[PDB]
């Protein structure tokens, strides 16, 4: 319908960096398999925690798993108790040893992934969806330094039978411009009536910064 | 490139052996696809067989056959109101050279000599005298044009 390519996959050569970074000849399928099982292992407890980014640098078979989140304090509970448990399970599930770096984003409401987190987690929690979005925004519109936003919500909105898509915005979000620095995040709400897939575009600025 | 106006056309180099626009254009209309070199061997061999059966300059024989097949009027198929009208229209120079060479090649290709060289030689010779089927297609095209002269007024 809207045949819109994932813009983090449309600027992954130009502005947005890769999330996983190594070099691999004849070891690549194994590094893919470990990358997948690591991201499944970091889905659940960190999606409780407020995860945004999961980068995996990979040096000579050590591993370096780095996570950008919005609360160092739920990811790091008691020191080593909440960190070294998921870290140690990453050390056992992989056949390797894990150096887990955990870091905070300076503003959670201007990460598109974290905006999709807070919006969809509100939308599972029986709030008004036009109020959620509309408050998804107002906040982020701001606050830093953030020249667009565009929120779309499809699915059983309000528990209705029809799957109505909604489309709210403010400012400038140019997708066809490649010097855009757009963050994109889709996260999917889980109501009892079903799943409300939320897409958030956030246009930070014109800046190439090449 | 129609509906925007006339489109610019490619300039055509002349022949190396004979030195004519019309020889090279005959080669590019001999070109059953792919083999321009083999088209050059057909056209060259056929024109030295025309040189054998005339003893003269082959391009003069070629331009005399080309003149004797070249039409002046062509019929159209324009349809005013529930009847198909054969409309006769003045033929441009390039359109007339195109119909002359294209009829020459195609009705040489229908002719029953053994190779293609003997076909094209005999068709350039018979069109030089005026005895090929292609000259009969010129006379049938002027037959349709003169038979349909009245419909030509539309000024179209």
């Amino acid at each position: 319908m809207g045949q819109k390519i994932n813009p983090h996959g449309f600027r992954l050569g130009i502005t947005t960096e890769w999330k996983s970074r190594w070099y691999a000849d004849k070891q690549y399928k194994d590094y893919v398999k470990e990358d997948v099982a690591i991201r499944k292992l970091l889905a659940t407890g960190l999606e409780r925690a407020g995860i945004a980014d999961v980068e995996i640098e990979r040096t000579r078979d050590r591993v370096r798993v780095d996570i950008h989140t919005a609360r160092p304090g739920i990811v790091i509970g008691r020191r080593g108790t909440e960190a070294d448990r998921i870290r140690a399970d990453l050390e056992k599930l992989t056949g390797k040893q894990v150096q887990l770096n955990i870091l905070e984003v300076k503003n959670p409401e201007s990460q598109a992934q974290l905006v999709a987190q807070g919006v969809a987690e509100q939308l599972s929690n029986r709030v008004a969806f036009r109020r959620a979005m509309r408050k998804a925004i107002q906040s982020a519109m701001r606050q830093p330094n953030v020249k667009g936003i565009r929120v779309q919500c499809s699915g059983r909105l309000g528990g209705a039978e029809m799957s109505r898509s909604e489309f709210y915005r403010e400012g400038r979000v140019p997708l066809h411009t490649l010097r855009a620095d757009i963050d994109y995040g889709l996260y999917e709400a889980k109501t009892t009536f079903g799943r409300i897939g939320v897409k958030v575009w956030i246009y930070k600025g014109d800046i190439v910064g090449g | 490139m129609p509906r925007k106006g006339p489109a610019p056309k490619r300039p055509l180099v002349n022949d190396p052996v004979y030195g004519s626009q019309l020889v090279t254009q005959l080669v590019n209309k001999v070109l059953l696809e792919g083999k321009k070199s083999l088209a050059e061997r057909i056209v060259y061999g056929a024109l030295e067989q025309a040189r054998e059966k005339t003893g003269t300059d082959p391009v003069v024989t070629l331009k005399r056959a080309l003149d004797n097949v070249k039409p002046a009027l062509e019929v159209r198929s324009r349809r005013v109101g529930g009847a198909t009208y054969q409309v006769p229209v003045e033929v441009r120079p390039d359109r007339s050279t195109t119909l002359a060479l294209r009829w020459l090649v195609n009705f040489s290709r229908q002719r029953r000599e053994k190779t293609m060289v003997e076909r094209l030689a005999n068709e350039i010779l018979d069109a030089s005298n005026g005895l090929g089927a292609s000259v009969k297609r010129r006379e049938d095209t002027h037959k349709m044009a003169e038979a349909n002269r009245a419909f030509a007024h539309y000024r179209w």
Binding site: V127, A128, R130, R131 | -
Partner: protein, 198 residues
């Protein structure tokens, strides 16, 4: 208009002066056919006013319901309208017409209550009246009866204004019962006002 009860840890709800009385009369989704389907929008007929007897009439167009209500609030905010009274009544029987909206607004003795249909009941409950007697004849609508009621309140005038138009000393313009009601209403204005000063 749902999910309004909320507590926010944000900057401000910006609650401030002019706590006026605001009534939303009707909302009908307004559709528009375009190429491939229908575009639904929203209309909110917004009545605002204070209990003195100043009335607004706003008409909100937006494709969200609280957005249309807020735009009607700002439009009636832009356009107020003064209504003259006697005590908390109306001066004299009028008929207003907004092209099909007929409304008869007749005064009554106090204690009777605002008797009117829901649009006229909205425009008169926001206003400074408490005891009048209206009726909405014709047009069976909300917009034309609100706008007809406001035209009916434009056909109002003071007893004093009438006296002024005719260059006559009051007494000589009113009859006497209505002058006594002026004495009653200004007397209770004096009682509640001087209880307001202390």
């Amino acid at each position: 208009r749902g999910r309004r009860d909320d507590r926010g840890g944000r900057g401000r709800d910006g609650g401030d002066k002019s706590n006026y009385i605001e009534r939303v009369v009707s909302i009908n989704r307004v559709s528009k056919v375009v190429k491939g389907g229908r575009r639904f929008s929203f209309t909110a007929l917004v009545i605002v006013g204070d209990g003195k007897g100043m009335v607004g009439v706003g008409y909100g167009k937006a494709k969200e319901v609280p957005a249309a209500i807020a735009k009607g609030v700002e439009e009636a905010r832009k356009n107020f309208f003064r209504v003259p009274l006697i005590g908390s009544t109306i001066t004299h029987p009028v008929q207003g017409e907004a092209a099909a909206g007929v409304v008869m607004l007749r005064p009554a003795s106090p204690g009777t209550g605002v008797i009117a249909g829901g649009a006229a009941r909205a425009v008169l409950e926001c206003a400074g009246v408490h005891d009048i007697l209206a009726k909405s004849l014709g047009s069976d609508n909300a917009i034309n009866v609100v706008h007809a009621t406001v035209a009916a309140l434009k056909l109002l005038q003071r007893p004093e204004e009438v006296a002024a138009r005719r260059g006559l000393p009051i007494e000589d313009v009113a009859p006497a019962g209505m002058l006594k009601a002026r004495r009653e209403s200004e007397a209770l204005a004096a009682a509640a006002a001087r209880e307001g000063s202390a």
